[PDB]
Amino acid sequence: CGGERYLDFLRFAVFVNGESVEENANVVVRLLIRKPECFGPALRGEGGS
C-alpha cells in the first residue's frame, strides 16, 4: 500500500508532459537497484519468484 504511493510520487517526479526527465530517471534507477528490496520480494534475484 505504501510502496505504491511512494512509487507514484516518483513517477510524477520523473515523467513530465509526456516525456521522461533523464536526470531524475537515472538517479531513481540507481537508487532502486542499490536498494533492491524496493522491487519487492519478487524481482529479488536469489530465491525470488
Binding site: 512509487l7 507514484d8 513517477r11 520523473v14 515523467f15 521522461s20 533523464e22 530517471a25 522491487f39 519487492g40
Partner: protein, 49 residues
C-alpha cells in the same frame, strides 16, 4: 498487483526516449539494458494474456 503495476509503470517512464537511442547515447542504452534485465518480456506478455 497495484504495487507491481506502479513499479513497472515507473520503470517504463524512466525508460529513455527513442531519439536518444538513435543518437546512441551510452547512458540511455545502459539504462534501457538495466530495465530489460530487470523485467523480461515473456512475463509482460503473460500478464497481458
Amino acid at each position: 498487483m497495484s504495487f507491481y503495476a506502479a513499479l513497472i509503470d515507473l520503470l517504463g517512464r524512466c525508460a529513455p526516449e527513442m531519439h536518444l537511442i538513435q543518437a546512441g547515447k551510452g547512458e540511455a542504452l545502459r539504462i534501457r539494458a538495466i530495465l530489460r534485465s530487470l523485467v523480461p518480456l515473456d512475463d509482460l506478455v503473460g500478464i497481458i494474456s
